[PDB]
Design a protein around this ligand. Structure first.
Ligand code: SF4
Ligand code: SF4
Ligand code: FCO
Ligand SMILES: [Fe+2]
Ligand code: NI
Ligand SMILES: [S]
Ligand SMILES: [S]
Lengths: 279, 482
């Protein structure tokens, strides 16, 4: 069928969301771009540039008003009248992230806040920051923009969380229409906006080393893989994600096997999960 | 003809937020300004934290090159803590980091740069584009480029599997900490790494390096532009023993046709044209300060202006390959002869002008990828399965350390000062900072700004060579600003 138009806007992000998506195995990223979505604007990968790229997005947004999906990566800085994140220039005026979200936010079918920065503020909003880094849902709500927001957090998210949420939403819309389908998607979001299929279970409660935790057998060095990682700083007890069985990068590892979980999907990441290397 | 001024914001098929503004007169760029438009302030966010947090926090500067920041950070922490990394952990770190060189260079040529020369499929994000995009390849060769673009998507993913085998995941490894690496390689996982490495090697040797020379041979005019200052920096990277003196890339500076030693005390960061407080200009990184000033008159970027003893230098594969002058790949030697009529054995046999050029920087990156294959092959023979890779040092109350390495895009250092067992200062001087910075306090342009001078613009409605030049440097403005 017709692939929905998608605009991918980067605010105060590190592009790790885009890179993690490039690591999707099934479907591959080529299948996603050629068969699932129509990625009409994405500054990292798109052919055109500059004001032409901005104008192309605006033309698509006009043609598919209320029907395009807006992926937001990174936080939205509101200090200094938005000047800490300029994303383009057209007709001799700079476009801040603030401006862009106010322009396209109201007209999207839905906003997918990908990554912990976009979902909850993340590192750019952490202690010591001074740009007014703001979560997408908070920014839209503070400005009276009612467009539904789905949070797909993680620093970075797993590719499956991004692709899987898109597939879930497109399935819902196929069977119920846009408004009916988005209603169904919102029903499977937890109180932090996260789809329960990927974020509904606790890492620690499903951890393979829980037996060592219960027995008090703790690793004293990172390279001791017999013990539980709690004394080394593992934040699995306070983290809701399915990494314990989904694993990372084609199943070759995950954070707890390799070192510790740092709670990267949680709304208080990083400050509420720090220091990373002590309990 | 007279002047046309062209602003490009966003510059696409780079990482991060960049505006380029060029003055074109009589068909050539005669002036340029680069503006990095997004700021986060990692250097102030980091203050007050447990120093060990840094090796996670700093990776979020950039999700394309996080292993570089991880490496610079743990090296800085290693020095500050007095951590003596076990030899097997040194090798494991090299295997983690080296695999992302392969990922990053392949990503850059195919998924960022190749569309400069190849027409992609007739659907977004490969259309719309400039109606006169100067795409010269035959239908056959163009299709080959698209096929390799698609294959390269799988190859770069496999490279991140290699990173994650001992790094935990990617982007943002868990496997590098102060004191070494957190997971001892097993025989089984070394076989898994090696098997993936063999597939990457085949692609690099049979597809990537050949296609860069082949496309270059259809764009020979692109070796005659983009010289800039012809000045380069390398700070050293990938230790090959625990002496601290033998490295895969040795340090050196090259400027005004002369090789010179690298002395890090000569680095100063200027801010006259950067959105930071005027009083902070001219600081070495050991005294660095980051005070944003987004309303400062006359400034035009969140990138500071690093200078080396007053010199404006570039960094990256060209810089490292020129400074170190390794033997060229067998592929390169043959295609330089057959396609360019060039007899060359070592990298510098390209000549300064051709090496320091738009297309020369793509060739350097391809040659460097081939060079890295040999290093990874050696580390796979050197590593000892089962030998411990980490020590567990106490956090000091007072300390300082500097970590130097080479990110895929160029020289990277992190400096940390610890006081009361917490970060008192953390300063980052990164690769695309050296390349994509604005003018310094005396008005001397940054490396890419200068390399844009002379770029041909025969058609101001299709000014494609401006961003082509920029993309040759593989910019990353998240890294440049942090
Ligand atoms: S603390 Fe971490 S390693 Fe230990 S059982 Fe819980 S999640 Fe697993
Ligand atoms: S294991 Fe923890 S730190 Fe790793 S990806 Fe999952 S939630 Fe994030
Ligand atoms: N490679 C990379 Fe990132 C940049 N520029 C760093 O350092
Ligand atoms: Fe810096
Ligand atoms: Ni980077
Ligand atoms: S990067
Ligand atoms: S990297």
């Amino acid at each position: 069928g017709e692939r929905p138009p998608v605009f991918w806007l980067q605010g105060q992000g590190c592009t790790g969301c885009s890179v993690t998506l490039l690591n999707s195995v099934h479907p591959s990223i080529a299948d996603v771009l050629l068969k699932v979505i129509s990625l009409e604007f994405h500054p990292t990968v798109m052919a055109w540039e500059g004001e032409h790229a901005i104008e192309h997005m605006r033309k698509v947004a006009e043609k598919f008003k209320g029907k395009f999906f807006l992926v937001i990566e990174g936080s939205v800085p509101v200090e200094a009248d938005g000047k800490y994140c300029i994303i383009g220039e057209a007709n001799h005026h700079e476009i801040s992230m603030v401006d862009a979200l106010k322009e396209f936010g109201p007209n999207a079918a839905a906003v997918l806040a990908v990554g912990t920065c976009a979902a909850y503020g993340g590192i750019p909003a952490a202690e010591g920051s001074e740009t007014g880094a703001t979560a997408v849902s908070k920014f839209l709500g503070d400005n009276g923009i009612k467009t539904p927001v789905v949070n797909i957090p993680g620093c970075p998210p797993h590719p499956d969380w991004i692709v899987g949420t898109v597939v879930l939403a497109l399935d819902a819309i196929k069977k119920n229409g846009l408004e009916g389908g988005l209603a169904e998607v919102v029903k499977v979001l937890d109180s932090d906006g996260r789809p329960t299929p990927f974020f509904g279970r606790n890492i620690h409660e499903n951890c393979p080393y829980l037996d060592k935790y219960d027995e008090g057998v703790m690793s004293a060095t990172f390279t001791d893989k017999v013990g539980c990682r709690y004394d080394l700083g593992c934040k699995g007890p306070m983290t809701m994600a399915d990494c314990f069985e989904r694993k990372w990068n084609g199943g070759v590892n995950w954070c707890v096997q390799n070192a510790v979980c740092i709670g990267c999907v949680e709304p208080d990441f990083p400050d509420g999960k720090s220091p990373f290397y002590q309990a | 003809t007279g002047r046309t001024t062209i602003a490009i914001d966003p510059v696409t098929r780079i990482e991060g937020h960049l505006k380029a503004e060029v003055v074109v007169e009589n068909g050539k760029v005669v002036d340029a300004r680069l503006s990095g438009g997004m700021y986060r302030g990692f250097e102030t966010i980091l203050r007050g934290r447990d120093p060990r947090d840094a090796s996670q926090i700093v990776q979020r500067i950039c999700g394309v090159c996080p292993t570089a920041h991880s490496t610079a950070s743990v090296l800085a922490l290693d020095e500050a803590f007095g951590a003596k990394v076990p030899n097997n952990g040194r090798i494991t770190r090299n295997l983690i980091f080296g695999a992302n060189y392969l990922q990053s260079h392949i990503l850059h040529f195919y998924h960022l740069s190749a569309q400069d020369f190849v027409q992609g499929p007739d659907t977004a994000p490969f259309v719309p584009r400039f109606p006169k995009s100067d795409l010269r390849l035959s239908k056959e060769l163009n299709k080959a480029g698209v096929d390799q673009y698609i294959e390269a998507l799988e190859v770069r993913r496999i490279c991140h599997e290699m990173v994650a085998l001992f790094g935990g995941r990617m982007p943002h490894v868990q496997g590098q900490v102060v004191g070494g690496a957190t997971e001892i390689p097993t025989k089984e996982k070394l076989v898994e790494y090696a098997a993936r490495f063999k597939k990457v090697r085949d692609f690099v040797e049979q597809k990537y390096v050949p296609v860069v020379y082949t496309i270059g041979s259809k764009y020979k005019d692109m070796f005659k532009v983009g010289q800039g200052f012809k000045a380069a920096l390398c700070v050293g990277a990938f230790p090959l023993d625990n002496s601290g003196k033998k490295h895969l890339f040795m340090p050196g500076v090259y400027a005004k046709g002369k090789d010179m030693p690298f002395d890090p005390s000569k680095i100063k960061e200027y801010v006259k044209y950067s959105w930071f407080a005027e009083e902070t200009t001219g600081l070495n990184y050991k005294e660095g300060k980051t005070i944003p000033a987004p309303d400062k008159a006359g400034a035009y970027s969140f990138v500071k202006a690093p200078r080396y003893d007053g010199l404006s230098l570039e960094v990256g594969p060209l810089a490292r390959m020129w400074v170190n002058n390794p033997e060229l790949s067998p592929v390169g030697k043959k295609l330089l002869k057959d396609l360019f009529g060039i007899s060359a054995k070592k990298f510098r046999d390209l000549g300064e002008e051709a090496a320091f050029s738009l297309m020369g920087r793509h060739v350097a990156r391809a040659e460097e990828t081939y060079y890295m294959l040999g290093a990874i092959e050696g580390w796979l023979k050197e590593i000892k399965a089962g030998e411990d890779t980490v020590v567990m040092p106490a956090v000091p109350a007072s300390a300082e350390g500097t970590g130097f390495t080479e990110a895929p895009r160029g020289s990277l250092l992190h400096y940390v000062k610890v006081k009361d067992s917490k970060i008192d200062n953390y300063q980052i001087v990164s690769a695309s900072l050296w390349n994509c910075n604005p003018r310094d306090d005396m008005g001397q342009r940054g490396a890419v700004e200068e390399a844009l001078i002379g770029i041909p613009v025969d058609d101001i409605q299709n000014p494609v060579n401006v961003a082509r030049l920029i993309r040759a440097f593989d910019p990353x403005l998240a890294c440049a600003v942090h």
